[PDB]
Amino acid sequence: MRGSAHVVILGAGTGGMPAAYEMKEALGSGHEVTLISANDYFQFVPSNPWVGVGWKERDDIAFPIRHYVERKGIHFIAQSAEQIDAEAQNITLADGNTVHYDYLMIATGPKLAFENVPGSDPHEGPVQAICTVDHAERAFAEYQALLREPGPIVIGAMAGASCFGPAYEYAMIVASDLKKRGMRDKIPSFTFITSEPYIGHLGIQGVGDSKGILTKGLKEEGIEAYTNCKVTKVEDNKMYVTQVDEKGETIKEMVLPVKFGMMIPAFKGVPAVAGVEGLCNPGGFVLVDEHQRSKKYANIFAAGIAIAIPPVETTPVPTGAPKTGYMIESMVSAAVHNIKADLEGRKGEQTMGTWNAVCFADMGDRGAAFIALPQLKPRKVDVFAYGRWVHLAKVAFEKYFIRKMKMGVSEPFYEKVLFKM
Amino acid sequence: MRGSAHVVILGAGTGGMPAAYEMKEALGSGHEVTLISANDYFQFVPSNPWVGVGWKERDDIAFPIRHYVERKGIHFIAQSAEQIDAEAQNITLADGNTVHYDYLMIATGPKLAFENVPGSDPHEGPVQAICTVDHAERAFAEYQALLREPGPIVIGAMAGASCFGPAYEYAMIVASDLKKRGMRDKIPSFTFITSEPYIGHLGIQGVGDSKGILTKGLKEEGIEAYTNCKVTKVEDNKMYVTQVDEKGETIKEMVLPVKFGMMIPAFKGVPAVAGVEGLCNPGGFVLVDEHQRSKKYANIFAAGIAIAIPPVETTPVPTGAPKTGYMIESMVSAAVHNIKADLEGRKGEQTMGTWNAVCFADMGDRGAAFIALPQLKPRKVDVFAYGRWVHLAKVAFEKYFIRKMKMGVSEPFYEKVLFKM
Ligand SMILES: Cc1cc2nc3c(=O)[nH]c(=O)nc-3n(C[C@H](O)[C@H](O)[C@H](O)COP(=O)(O)OP(=O)(O)OC[C@H]3O[C@@H](n4cnc5c(N)ncnc54)[C@H](O)[C@@H]3O)c2cc1C
Ligand SMILES: Cc1cc2nc3c(=O)[nH]c(=O)nc-3n(C[C@H](O)[C@H](O)[C@H](O)COP(=O)(O)OP(=O)(O)OC[C@H]3O[C@@H](n4cnc5c(N)ncnc54)[C@H](O)[C@@H]3O)c2cc1C
Ligand SMILES: CCCCCCCCCCCCO[C@@H]1O[C@H](CO)[C@@H](O[C@H]2O[C@H](CO)[C@@H](O)[C@H](O)[C@H]2O)[C@H](O)[C@H]1O
Ligand SMILES: CCCCCCCCCCCCO[C@@H]1O[C@H](CO)[C@@H](O[C@H]2O[C@H](CO)[C@@H](O)[C@H](O)[C@H]2O)[C@H](O)[C@H]1O
Ligand SMILES: [S]
Ligand SMILES: [S]
Ligand SMILES: [S]
Ligand SMILES: [S]
Ligand SMILES: [S]
Ligand SMILES: [S]
Ligand SMILES: [S]
Ligand SMILES: [S]
Ligand SMILES: [S]
Ligand SMILES: [S]
């Protein structure tokens, strides 16, 4: 209000949850912090591929938000925003209620654009998805139906996708789970389809020897792999794939039967955010400046997958670069600090810093991880690692992050890196 | 050098010339400022369409650089950079000589991408260009050859172009010049082809009533107009045009004979800059941050058409947004201030400010001008004006800008706006 600003945070995910705590901590008792989110529970997204092969249960990676944020003085509304009026600064919720804000922080993550590919929606076909825990449980269910009645497998990533790690990870743990059940030899074919220009491109033009190691890993497991692919439609339990060459010209078309399938979809901005005029690029991602502030509305900030990051490369089949957890945190921190300063007559000069991608994938007893920065080669850090220690690190970090979402966050969030001192 | 940094400015155009003066002024006698440019003369680019119909002479809009910058202590090298080594911080010139720098400011403007359209190069066909004074003189020459032997005219802008004003302006003054010579009725057809989704889109989704007024202006002059066009090739004195619809689907193909033609080309980054690894987007435009600093090299800055600005809209046929003079100046000012601060232990926090487009077109006794900001609608200023006063303003500003390039620049460059006090 007129002297004690009301700060609304939209989306209680990887960026939104900590943003609510950090926001509340920074603003203190004199300001209202409201967290709005479509679900009443928080999920740890990087654990979803394991849920999708049944190595993890929902109960292990998700929990109810309300008590933990409210014990902190944050108001929680478990409702989806349907409309945003930036002029009037009102948010219309699904139930019709409206919420007013003085500052909006948008952390709504991705809309899964199943509509780019007719038939590709998990509910209308064999092609599943593992990005949300609801979808991963459903993926597991179809996985069990493959066990009872074996048929061809197709795993991969769609045109326009930006999140390739999980596709490779899921392909590997499925192959692995098939072996551990002695069922692997029952599979007619096992294909990996990706829009990447080559295996291990990962949306980032490769990191370390990702090409060689992912290539060998796929061959090792008897998975046939195709790149520069776009799926045009899913129909009659068949995936229609077009493969192009360096200059976008078609070099073949394939029709693949699928009994069990998982393709990572392209991400768009959610409709409520994409619907705000002049706020977003054509993909529905919020245009912001270095400080996380909307270019159009000075009291709207944004962070996480929700924001637009300009492409630095152009591939035969459209692909995007990933937005990963450490960079999301830096964006969150910057947005909070800069809002706090708006409330105190300063201009917040904090930025998210250097673009970077960090990803960790657990395969069982060991994992793979990479770090790349900045976005364009030649990089200052370009490492791809595999080992048992990646597994331990993933396990520890999940445990840590979830504990922090329950206990609360101050916080220069990543001093997990005090394992030096 | 080790304590008195050497600042090189690449490109002596609308942004580069003032950047050299402002740089020298800000750094004083203790630092070396070198200006490198492919031509030994400065040209006033906005005057080129008039040169292309013969209303202006080269001698009126261009002048030799050397004396004016050297009398200011700036070193001038009238040589084109062929290669840039960002690691070693050396620039290789056309003649083989190399120049070392501690800070590089890149202001090289556009490469005219005639190669996007086979046959479209001015030297290999009837399709001319008016972006450089050399090309506009050549355009005028072909214009006189049309006078002696009348045939079809085709004026417009290519796919990927970002500079539409001048196409409309040139079409109008040609029509006008035809009338004043009583030759207008000798023309079989007069076609206007543009990649814009509609007339008066101007790369900026329209400004004021540009649609209605440009539409009417073209009809008024008997010019037939097509939008959503891309020229695929120029061959045998014929332009091959494909017109698409809202979803990129072809709704017709045309083969147009041309006796006289002028299409604005798509712009790319020049090869020396585009060739620096990791410096540029796929178009060869320098990736910079709000402060004009290269994202990859902390001692490389950039300004003007040379820098990359992310798209905010997506059209059926690829088009770009314009980079116009006031915004270029703001970029220049920011880059200079921020370099000066790098030389003094500070961090320069200056930015170019709000995106904006300002364009003035003289038609003879009157002109048209527009101002739009910021880039995305709804805007804070969205005006399209026509009148005799636009003409006077254009004339005055040309006179002013050229005088300033000769006398020198301090300078919060635009206080021409003191016509209020
Ligand atoms: C399968 C998978 C694996 C990943 N693995 C890694 C990894 O290993 N390491 C890493 O660093 N990152 C990884 N990522 C990438 C990234 O870190 C995650 O996607 C992360 O969850 C993104 O955080 P976010 O806050 O932007 O979006 P999210 O975590 O998706 O949060 C968005 C929230 O907004 C809510 N929401 C959506 N629409 C509305 C609405 N209209 N109104 C109200 N609320 C709404 C959603 O319910 C959700 O809670 C992974 C991504 C996925 C999909
Ligand atoms: C026809 C036309 C009309 C325009 N009308 C308007 C208008 O009315 N108002 C407005 O505000 N703007 C207008 N513009 C847009 C814009 O202001 C101009 O294009 C402006 O000149 C851009 O300035 P710049 O410094 O980035 O590039 P330029 O002015 O093109 O300068 C680039 C310089 O770099 C040099 N160079 C190129 N390569 C090398 C190399 N390898 N080594 C060394 N030097 C090199 C070139 O010789 C040139 O001198 C117009 C543009 C054009 C083409
Ligand atoms: C995190 C995002 C990346 C994508 C997600 C995960 C993709 C799946 C990875 C599959 C890799 C499988 O292939 C595996 O690779 C490494 C080679 O580097 C081999 O391992 C080799 O290097 C490792 C160390 O890095 C040594 O400990 C080992 O002694 C050596 O054999 C394994 O013997 C091989 O089995
Ligand atoms: C600067 C970038 C924009 C593109 C470059 C230039 C494009 C060419 C412009 C062609 C316009 C010709 O059409 C011209 O438009 C205006 C209408 O607004 C009319 O003019 C009308 O409005 C003006 C004021 O704005 C009045 O002074 C006038 O009394 C009235 O008739 C002219 O009678 C008409 O002849
Ligand atoms: S999903
Ligand atoms: S990802
Ligand atoms: S990833
Ligand atoms: S973007
Ligand atoms: S690299
Ligand atoms: S040109
Ligand atoms: S332009
Ligand atoms: S323009
Ligand atoms: S860009
Ligand atoms: S607007």
Side-chain angles (χ1 to χ4, degrees):
Chain A
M1 52 202 188
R2 300 250 197 98
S4 66
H6 186 198
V7 181
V8 170
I9 293 146
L10 227 206
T14 297
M17 268 272 259
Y21 288 126
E22 294 176 37
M23 194 66 80
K24 184 55 181 180
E25 170 83 31
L27 261 37
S29 50
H31 303 268
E32 188 181 9
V33 176
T34 306
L35 180 61
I36 307 175
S37 184
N39 306 127
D40 65 7
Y41 62 89
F42 168 89
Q43 64 184 280
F44 187 64
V45 172
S47 293
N48 287 323
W50 280 34
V51 172
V53 74
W55 291 1
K56 265 174 186 174
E57 295 255 21
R58 163 189 297 265
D59 321 87
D60 309 325
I61 81 161
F63 67 81
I65 289 162
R66 188 166 304 279
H67 183 63
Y68 306 100
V69 303
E70 286 192 333
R71 87 189 308 184
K72 235 69 187 178
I74 295 158
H75 310 287
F76 180 62
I77 309 186
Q79 193 84 186
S80 176
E82 305 289 74
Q83 189 200 288
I84 301 175
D85 186 343
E87 302 298 348
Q89 309 173 16
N90 278 318
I91 303 151
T92 308
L93 307 174
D95 70 32
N97 247 85
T98 94
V99 177
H100 180 269
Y101 66 83
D102 300 292
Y103 289 93
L104 178 55
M105 198 198 303
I106 292 183
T108 39
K111 180 210 187 137
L112 311 167
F114 298 116
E115 59 276 355
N116 288 8
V117 182
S120 93
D121 182 294
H123 286 89
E124 67 195 13
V127 192
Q128 297 304 293
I130 48 83
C131 304
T132 67
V133 62
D134 277 351
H135 279 150
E137 279 184 329
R138 185 181 173 86
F140 183 44
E142 310 300 351
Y143 174 66
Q144 305 180 288
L146 169 84
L147 262 20
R148 302 187 294 263
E149 320 182 20
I153 294 182
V154 187
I155 293 179
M158 300 297 196
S162 58
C163 206
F164 301 87
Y168 291 96
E169 175 184 354
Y170 192 66
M172 297 300 295
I173 56 182
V174 166
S176 166
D177 190 79
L178 257 20
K179 283 191 288 180
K180 207 174 311 160
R181 288 180 186 256
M183 204 81 48
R184 174 70 181 91
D185 46 294
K186 269 74 175 185
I187 304 299
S189 58
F190 194 146
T191 314
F192 187 87
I193 298 295
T194 174
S195 50
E196 306 167 81
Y198 53 86
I199 295 298
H201 173 279
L202 299 164
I204 59 183
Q205 308 126 76
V207 56
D209 195 19
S210 58
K211 184 156 172 286
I213 296 171
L214 264 47
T215 289
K216 186 189 185 72
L218 291 178
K219 182 176 187 173
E220 220 173 66
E221 299 298 331
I223 296 156
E224 196 179 42
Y226 296 88
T227 65
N228 288 304
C229 290
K230 61 196 312 163
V231 185
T232 54
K233 74 184 175 205
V234 181
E235 192 178 66
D236 285 71
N237 312 101
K238 303 190 295 182
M239 200 173 313
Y240 293 62
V241 185
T242 293
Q243 174 178 45
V244 297
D245 68 339
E246 302 175 346
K247 300 214 300 288
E249 306 299 344
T250 305
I251 59 160
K252 60 155 157 297
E253 297 185 349
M254 290 190 273
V255 178
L256 299 165
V258 188
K259 173 68 169 202
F260 178 62
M262 199 296 290
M263 295 295 285
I264 303 291
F267 291 164
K268 290 175 187 171
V270 304
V273 170
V276 181
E277 186 186 22
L279 183 68
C280 290
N281 69 25
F285 293 102
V286 181
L287 298 159
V288 304
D289 64 23
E290 279 156 31
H291 305 86
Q292 304 305 141
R293 186 188 312 263
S294 163
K295 283 197 157 81
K296 184 123 279 296
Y297 299 95
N299 64 340
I300 293 180
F301 286 62
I305 286 178
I307 78 158
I309 302 204
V312 301
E313 176 210 15
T314 195
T315 50
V317 180
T319 57
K323 295 150 188 160
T324 58
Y326 174 74
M327 198 174 69
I328 293 178
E329 293 315 322
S330 302
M331 299 186 200
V332 164
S333 301
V336 165
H337 179 284
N338 293 336
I339 287 174
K340 173 167 192 176
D342 254 45
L343 291 182
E344 299 174 2
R346 285 121 55 173
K347 197 225 170 177
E349 283 297 335
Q350 186 168 341
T351 81
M352 74 163 199
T354 300
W355 182 100
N356 62 83
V358 178
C359 189
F360 277 63
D362 203 338
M363 232 100 311
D365 299 79
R366 23 196 61 103
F370 66 73
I371 295 165
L373 64 308
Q375 195 177 359
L376 232 23
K377 288 176 185 285
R379 301 193 161 117
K380 299 173 189 300
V381 180
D382 188 68
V383 176
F384 186 101
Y386 179 93
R388 196 204 345 176
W389 69 271
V390 172
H391 161 79
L392 300 180
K394 186 73 165 197
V395 165
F397 184 81
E398 178 186 335
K399 175 182 286 58
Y400 178 76
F401 194 90
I402 286 172
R403 181 184 68 97
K404 278 333 205 88
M405 287 317 90
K406 285 175 200 186
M407 272 175 47
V409 151
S410 314
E411 195 169 305
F413 201 0
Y414 279 71
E415 8 81 72
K416 95 169 188 186
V417 196
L418 64 61
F419 64 0
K420 306 303 285 62
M421 277 193 49
Chain B
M1 52 202 188
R2 300 250 197 98
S4 66
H6 186 198
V7 181
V8 170
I9 293 146
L10 227 206
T14 297
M17 268 272 259
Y21 288 126
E22 294 176 37
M23 194 66 80
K24 184 55 181 180
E25 170 83 31
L27 261 37
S29 50
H31 303 268
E32 188 181 9
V33 176
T34 306
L35 180 61
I36 307 175
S37 184
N39 306 127
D40 65 7
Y41 62 89
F42 168 89
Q43 64 184 280
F44 187 64
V45 172
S47 293
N48 287 323
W50 280 34
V51 172
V53 74
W55 291 1
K56 265 174 186 174
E57 295 255 21
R58 163 189 297 265
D59 321 87
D60 309 325
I61 81 161
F63 67 81
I65 289 162
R66 188 166 304 279
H67 183 63
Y68 306 100
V69 303
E70 286 192 333
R71 88 189 308 184
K72 235 69 187 178
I74 295 158
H75 310 287
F76 180 62
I77 309 186
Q79 193 84 186
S80 176
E82 305 289 74
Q83 189 200 288
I84 301 175
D85 186 343
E87 302 298 348
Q89 309 173 16
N90 278 318
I91 303 151
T92 308
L93 307 174
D95 70 32
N97 247 85
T98 94
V99 177
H100 180 269
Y101 66 83
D102 300 292
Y103 289 93
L104 178 55
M105 198 198 303
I106 292 183
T108 39
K111 180 210 187 137
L112 311 167
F114 298 116
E115 59 276 355
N116 288 8
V117 182
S120 93
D121 182 294
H123 286 89
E124 67 195 13
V127 192
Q128 297 304 293
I130 48 83
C131 304
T132 67
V133 62
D134 277 351
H135 279 150
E137 279 184 329
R138 185 181 173 86
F140 183 44
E142 310 300 351
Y143 174 66
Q144 305 180 288
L146 169 84
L147 262 20
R148 302 187 294 263
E149 320 182 20
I153 294 182
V154 187
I155 293 179
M158 300 297 196
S162 58
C163 206
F164 301 87
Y168 291 96
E169 175 184 354
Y170 192 66
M172 297 300 295
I173 56 182
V174 166
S176 166
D177 190 79
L178 257 20
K179 283 191 288 180
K180 207 174 311 160
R181 288 180 186 256
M183 204 81 48
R184 174 70 181 91
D185 46 294
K186 269 74 175 185
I187 304 299
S189 58
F190 194 146
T191 314
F192 187 87
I193 298 295
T194 174
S195 50
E196 306 167 81
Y198 53 86
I199 295 298
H201 173 279
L202 299 164
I204 59 183
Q205 308 126 76
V207 56
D209 195 19
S210 58
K211 184 156 172 286
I213 296 171
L214 264 47
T215 289
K216 186 189 185 72
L218 291 178
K219 182 176 187 173
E220 220 173 66
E221 299 298 331
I223 296 156
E224 196 179 42
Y226 296 88
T227 65
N228 288 304
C229 290
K230 61 196 312 163
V231 185
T232 54
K233 74 184 175 205
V234 181
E235 192 178 66
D236 285 71
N237 312 101
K238 303 190 295 182
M239 200 173 313
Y240 293 62
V241 185
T242 293
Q243 174 178 45
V244 297
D245 68 339
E246 302 175 346
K247 300 214 300 288
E249 306 299 344
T250 305
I251 59 160
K252 60 155 157 297
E253 297 185 349
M254 290 190 273
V255 178
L256 299 165
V258 188
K259 173 68 169 202
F260 178 62
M262 199 296 290
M263 295 295 285
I264 303 291
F267 291 164
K268 290 175 187 171
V270 304
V273 170
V276 181
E277 186 186 22
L279 183 68
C280 290
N281 69 25
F285 293 102
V286 181
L287 298 159
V288 304
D289 64 23
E290 279 156 31
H291 305 86
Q292 305 305 141
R293 186 188 312 263
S294 163
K295 283 197 157 81
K296 184 123 279 296
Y297 299 95
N299 64 340
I300 293 180
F301 286 62
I305 286 178
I307 78 158
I309 302 204
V312 301
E313 176 210 15
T314 195
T315 50
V317 180
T319 57
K323 295 150 188 160
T324 58
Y326 174 74
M327 198 174 69
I328 293 178
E329 293 315 322
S330 302
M331 299 186 200
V332 164
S333 301
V336 165
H337 179 284
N338 293 336
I339 287 174
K340 173 167 192 176
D342 254 45
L343 291 182
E344 299 174 2
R346 285 121 55 173
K347 197 225 170 177
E349 283 297 335
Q350 186 168 341
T351 81
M352 74 163 199
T354 300
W355 182 100
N356 62 83
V358 178
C359 189
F360 277 63
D362 203 338
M363 232 100 311
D365 299 79
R366 23 196 61 103
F370 66 73
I371 295 165
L373 64 308
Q375 195 177 359
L376 232 23
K377 288 176 185 285
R379 301 193 161 117
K380 299 173 189 300
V381 180
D382 188 68
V383 176
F384 186 101
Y386 179 93
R388 196 204 345 176
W389 69 271
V390 172
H391 161 79
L392 300 180
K394 186 73 165 197
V395 165
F397 184 81
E398 178 186 335
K399 175 182 286 58
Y400 178 76
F401 194 90
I402 286 172
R403 181 184 68 97
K404 278 333 205 88
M405 287 317 90
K406 285 175 200 186
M407 272 175 47
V409 151
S410 314
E411 195 169 305
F413 201 0
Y414 279 71
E415 8 81 72
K416 95 169 188 186
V417 196
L418 64 61
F419 64 0
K420 306 303 285 62
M421 277 193 49

